[PDB]
Amino acid sequence: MENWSALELLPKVGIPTDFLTHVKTSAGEEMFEALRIYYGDDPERYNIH
Amino acid sequence: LTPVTMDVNYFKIPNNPRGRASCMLAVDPYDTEAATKAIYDHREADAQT
Amino acid sequence: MDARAVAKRPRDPADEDNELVTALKAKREVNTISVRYLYHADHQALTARFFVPEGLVEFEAQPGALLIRMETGCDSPRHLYISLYLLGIRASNVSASTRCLLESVYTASAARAALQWLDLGPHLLHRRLETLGCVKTVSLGITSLLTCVMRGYLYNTLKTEVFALMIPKDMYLTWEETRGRLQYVYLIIVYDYDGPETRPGIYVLTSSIAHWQTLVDVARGKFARERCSFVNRRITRPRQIPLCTGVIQKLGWCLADDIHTSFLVHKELKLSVVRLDNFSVELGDFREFV
Amino acid sequence: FEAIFGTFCNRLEWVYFLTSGLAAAAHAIKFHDLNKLTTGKMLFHVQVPRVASGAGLPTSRQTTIMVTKYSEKSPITIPFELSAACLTYLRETFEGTILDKILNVEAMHTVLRALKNTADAMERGLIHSFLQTLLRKAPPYFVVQTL
Amino acid sequence: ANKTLFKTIDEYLLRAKDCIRGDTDTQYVCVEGTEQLIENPCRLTQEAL
Amino acid sequence: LSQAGAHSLTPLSMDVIRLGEKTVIMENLRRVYKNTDTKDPLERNVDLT
Amino acid sequence: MAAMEANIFCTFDHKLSIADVGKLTKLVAAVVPIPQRLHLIKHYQLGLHQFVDHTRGYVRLRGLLRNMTLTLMRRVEGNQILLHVPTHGLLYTVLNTGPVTWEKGDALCVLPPLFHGPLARENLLTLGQWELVLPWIVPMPLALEINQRLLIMGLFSLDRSYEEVKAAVQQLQTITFRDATFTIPDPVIDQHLLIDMKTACLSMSMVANLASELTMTYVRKLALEDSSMLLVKCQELLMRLPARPQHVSPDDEIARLSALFVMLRQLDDLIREQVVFTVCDVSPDNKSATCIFKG
Amino acid sequence: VENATLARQALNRIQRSNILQSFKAKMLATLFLLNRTRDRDYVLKFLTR
Amino acid sequence: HPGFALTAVRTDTFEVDMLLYSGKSCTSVIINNPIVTKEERDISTTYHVTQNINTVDMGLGYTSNTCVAYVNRVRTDMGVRVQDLFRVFPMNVYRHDEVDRWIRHAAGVERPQLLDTETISMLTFGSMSERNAAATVHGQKAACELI
Numbered sequence A: 001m002e003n004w005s006a007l008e009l010l011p012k013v014g015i016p017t018d019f020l021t022h023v024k025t026s027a028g029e030e031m032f033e034a035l036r037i038y039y040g041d042d043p044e045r046y047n048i049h
Numbered sequence B: 001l002t003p004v005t006m007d008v009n010y011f012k013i014p015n016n017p018r019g020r021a022s023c024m025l026a027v028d029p030y031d032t033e034a035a036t037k038a039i040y041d042h043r044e045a046d047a048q049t
Numbered sequence C: 001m002d003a004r005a006v007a008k009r010p011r012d013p014a015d016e017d018n019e020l021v022t023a024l025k026a027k028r029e030v031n032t033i034s035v036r037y038l039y040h041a042d043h044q045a046l047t048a049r050f051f052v053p054e055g056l057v058e059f060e061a062q063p064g065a066l067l068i069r070m071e072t073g074c075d076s077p078r079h080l081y082i083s084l085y086l087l088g089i090r091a092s093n094v095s096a097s098t099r100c101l102l103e104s105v106y107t108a109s110a111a112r113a114a115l116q117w118l119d120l121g122p123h124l125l126h127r128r129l130e131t132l133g134c135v136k137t138v139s140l141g142i143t144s145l146l147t148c149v150m151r152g153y154l155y156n157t158l159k160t161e162v163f164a165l166m167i168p169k170d171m172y173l174t175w176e177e178t179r180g181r182l183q184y185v186y187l188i189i190v191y192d193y194d195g196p197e198t199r200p201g202i203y204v205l206t207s208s209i210a211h212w213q214t215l216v217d218v219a220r221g222k223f224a225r226e227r228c229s230f231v232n233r234r235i236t237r238p239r240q241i242p243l244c245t246g247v248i249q250k251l252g253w254c255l256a257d258d259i260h261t262s263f264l265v266h267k268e269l270k271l272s273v274v275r276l277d278n279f280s281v282e283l284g285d286f287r288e289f290v
Numbered sequence D: 001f002e003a004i005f006g007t008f009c010n011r012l013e014w015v016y017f018l019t020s021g022l023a024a025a026a027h028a029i030k031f032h033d034l035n036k037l038t039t040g041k042m043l044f045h046v047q048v049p050r051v052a053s054g055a056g057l058p059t060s061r062q063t064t065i066m067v068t069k070y071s072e073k074s075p076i077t078i079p080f081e082l083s084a085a086c087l088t089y090l091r092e093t094f095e096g097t098i099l100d101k102i103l104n105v106e107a108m109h110t111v112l113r114a115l116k117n118t119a120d121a122m123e124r125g126l127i128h129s130f131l132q133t134l135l136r137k138a139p140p141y142f143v144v145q146t147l
Numbered sequence E: 001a002n003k004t005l006f007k008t009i010d011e012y013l014l015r016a017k018d019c020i021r022g023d024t025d026t027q028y029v030c031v032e033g034t035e036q037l038i039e040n041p042c043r044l045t046q047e048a049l
Numbered sequence F: 001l002s003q004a005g006a007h008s009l010t011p012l013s014m015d016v017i018r019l020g021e022k023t024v025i026m027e028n029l030r031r032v033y034k035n036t037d038t039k040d041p042l043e044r045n046v047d048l049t
Numbered sequence G: 001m002a003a004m005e006a007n008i009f010c011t012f013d014h015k016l017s018i019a020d021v022g023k024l025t026k027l028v029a030a031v032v033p034i035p036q037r038l039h040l041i042k043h044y045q046l047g048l049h050q051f052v053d054h055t056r057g058y059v060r061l062r063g064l065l066r067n068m069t070l071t072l073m074r075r076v077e078g079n080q081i082l083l084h085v086p087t088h089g090l091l092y093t094v095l096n097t098g099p100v101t102w103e104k105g106d107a108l109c110v111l112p113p114l115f116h117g118p119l120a121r122e123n124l125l126t127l128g129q130w131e132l133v134l135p136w137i138v139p140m141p142l143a144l145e146i147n148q149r150l151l152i153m154g155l156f157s158l159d160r161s162y163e164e165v166k167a168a169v170q171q172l173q174t175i176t177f178r179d180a181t182f183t184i185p186d187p188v189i190d191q192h193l194l195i196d197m198k199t200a201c202l203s204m205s206m207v208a209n210l211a212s213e214l215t216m217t218y219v220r221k222l223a224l225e226d227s228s229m230l231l232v233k234c235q236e237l238l239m240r241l242p243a244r245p246q247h248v249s250p251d252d253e254i255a256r257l258s259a260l261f262v263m264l265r266q267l268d269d270l271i272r273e274q275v276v277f278t279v280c281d282v283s284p285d286n287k288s289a290t291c292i293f294k295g
Numbered sequence H: 001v002e003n004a005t006l007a008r009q010a011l012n013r014i015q016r017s018n019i020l021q022s023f024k025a026k027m028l029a030t031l032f033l034l035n036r037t038r039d040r041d042y043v044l045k046f047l048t049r
Numbered sequence I: 001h002p003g004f005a006l007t008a009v010r011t012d013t014f015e016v017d018m019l020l021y022s023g024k025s026c027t028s029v030i031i032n033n034p035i036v037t038k039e040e041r042d043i044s045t046t047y048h049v050t051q052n053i054n055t056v057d058m059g060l061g062y063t064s065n066t067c068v069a070y071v072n073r074v075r076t077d078m079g080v081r082v083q084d085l086f087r088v089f090p091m092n093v094y095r096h097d098e099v100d101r102w103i104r105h106a107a108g109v110e111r112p113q114l115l116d117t118e119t120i121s122m123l124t125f126g127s128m129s130e131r132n133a134a135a136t137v138h139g140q141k142a143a144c145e146l147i
Helices: A004-009 A023-028 B008-012 B032-040 C003-007 C019-027 C084-090 C096-105 C109-120 C212-222 C224-236 D021-025 D084-091 D098-137 D141-146 E005-014 G018-026 G058-067 G140-157 G162-172 G191-210 G213-222 G229-235 G250-269 H013-029 H040-048 I097-107 I116-124
Strands: A013-015 C046-053 C066-071 C079-083 C129-135 C143-153 C165-168 C172-174 C182-192 C199-207 C246-255 C259-266 C269-276 C280-283 C287-289 D008-010 D026-030 D041-047 D064-083 F015-018 F023-026 F043-048 G007-011 G031-034 G040-042 G069-077 G080-084 G091-095 G107-111 G136-139 G174-177 G180-183 G277-279 G288-293 I012-022 I027-031 I035-040 I044-057 I064-074
Touching (some): C046 C079, C066 C165, C079 C084, C079 C109, C084 C165, C084 C199, C212 G058, C287 G250, D021 D098, D064 D084, D098 I027, G058 G107, G091 G277, G107 G140, G140 G191, G162 G174, G213 G229
Parallel strands (some): D026 I027
Antiparallel strands (some): C046 C143, C066 C079, C143 C280, C182 C199, C246 C280, C246 C287, D064 I044, F015 F023, F043 I012, G031 G069, G069 G080, G107 G136, G107 G277, I027 I044
């Protein structure tokens, strides 16, 4: 539902993250709405329309 | 209403007054059949005792 | 030949300028056509183009459909190109509700003609079929054009997206609890010899086994009832000379982690499929077993 | 309307083997022919101190003790991967529009990030392997105190 | 295992250990490497507490 | 082996404890294992019989 | 996910003497099987030694070797080994590890080793009671002979007396091929050979049922007017028992032969071994050859 | 914060059970802090935690 | 009371934090520069980075000490629940069919059922017959053994 490609392409501000638990545990236990995970390199960010 | 022979040690620690454990944090998330089997199946040993 | 010639590592296919650029540079002449980069110049997959009538193109609009060539027993079209979904109609393995759904989808004269031709003759099903590969394109029209790969991965023009292979859920088959890291996928057609006529079962099997004899031993373990039916027909019904209890054809290889479950939407109807995300085709011929 | 108040990225905490306190236990040396050697050994020669004895006691003889030690091996590995589209946009530019330049710089930043992450992973793996072997050779408190 | 003291200590540190699956309700023996080994001093003293 | 050592040295900050004229360095390796897939080998299991 | 690796590095955690490394260097370009593919593996998984078991059967070892993936050995370093997974259709150099003589143009199969000569060749990397056991690469006729001997022993074992079974196993286990003598180790009869025996019996039953009268009578009719060493040696095997064909029907004959071909393929498959290499070159000392990989 | 270091993906059964046990024990122990205890070190430690 | 007094044995597993001491330059590590390797395919490329590290111990005695500093939880339940031999020996049956059925029903034991290949795999490479419970609150089952 979110535009993940826009997040990947646009510039970002770097911060030190402070998850209390492991980041994958926070993802797997559904700490957040609107999660996306992918492994390796996913080329879908390259197809602009 | 309970039988007169109900274990008296059951009342000496925090327990479910129902007589069987039904805490869902023990069961896998969204696993409906496992949850129903945990709380209702009397052919499956109660988790607490 | 000399030492420097031997030492020289080969030319990069990407740093040499192509033939058209070479000619234009040689004459120093401009051209309107953009020429610096040639598309598909580095596609290692082998593709072919197929024409198919409008009625047959349904659920093959999305990329990833398996494409089969069927024999009509006639000289006017000679051959037709059909998908695994259409064979879903004839297969006994598919459930009643899915059969009704994808029978309502293919309500066209061409598809019904394909079914009549398939059931009409006296040959077994696999003798009438030839597998081409997986499709990834569509240009719609009264006659539609499909491009199919027959050796390679499935991807679009810039490789910016890799396509999966879609198998209907009733046809999907596994025989191992924990999957091997590398999986081979096979097409199985198995015949049940009941009284009136043979009912064929159609499956797509994902397995870690590459050796033929071990695979056929596992298959004979799984399909014992059909072998019993074959022998029973051989006993009860002489002068009927059946051949084979089943055939196995290899087509492809994929990684176990790429396997997923998904659904397909067509005319607001949902068909459920198994999805092989990074599937690459590698076709074999039908090998028969008893 | 909807508002996006900020897009954030994760800043990784880079670690090095030489900047850890654990490296104090280590004597770190680089050897460019390391894969060429099979095993390395050290030799020790020991002669024991002695003490004169009084009448009636047997006198102790001279003794020489010689021992040997051997090395250990443990390689480490990290993969990283890139997509063919990323390589194409890294190399190729089409028509020079703004969006094409954006895609080019995106591919370049992807390869840079992959290289940085791989190097950091190699440092962490070195630390982890050293800690594993150091734990393997170490006996517990009761053994050493009894000794 | 009837060996010299130092050889015994060495094999206690390396080999004389067992592993158990950490994610199943019952104790299944695991294979070395897939997850961390467990120390058991009772293996050395040959006693139970 | 000793003569192959580095000739240059750099300063860095760390915590130290006094243990009777012996001074030793205190370190926790939490930062290297923070969000990784490997388990810290100093967090271990031990079992008793 | 993680794409399958083509180059595999193997490291021995056992310490190696200079003699061990010297032995390893000789093995470059040989074929070694592995059970699983990773970029970096331990030497325990390398080779056929891991499957040696109290069962000792040759048939089960043949079954296990069929499912392992084959690799060629690239050049060796200190304490490291590099293995390469070949691809179908490319050209490779391969080392003749076994004593079997190769020839130009024949097809090669991979098979568990069978002992030969003094049986003192076993110097291959004995370290920590792990041993580098490698399969044999043999030409098709020898593999066919081996499988045929095993299946014939299995079939003959049924209902025959124990002592004559021993005698038959003794005479069958030895093989002379291309001017060399080999012997099959541990020809155990068990479930693995039993399943093959069952399939062979089924295929023979179907072949006997399908075959037309023309096919059966061809040999009998030929002996009435032909005479040759081939025929007389051929008819000695058969049970001792003008006219016109009682029934002529080419369509029935065609269909019947069509089914009989499928049954013959079923019978053939259980002694056939998959071709892994096809050779067209040979070092005149027979130690190495260049082959095309397939399978 | 006590279990943050061991889980590095979605929780398994045993980790969930440990978390549940800790929940119950700590909830029972620290329900009414200042009525329960009034010693200085414990309160300072609790506030620091 | 029957005429015997069986004794039980069980193991409980603990999750602990350990403390390790190591002496300055107790061991020397020798390393080479990381080596990269490329593997190409149509849709992507992957790079493998390997570094082999080699270590040697540089003390004539135990130069490192470990201790079990802190424990905080029992992974097992410390229960009094006894495991069934019918699962660990899944193929022994009473020679009399009715007696076997009666004993299994009285003990509450599932009927044995295995294929040939399943039996072979179970004997050679043990299978996990006992399934997980519907819920677990006390953690892993520490099964008692009876002698």
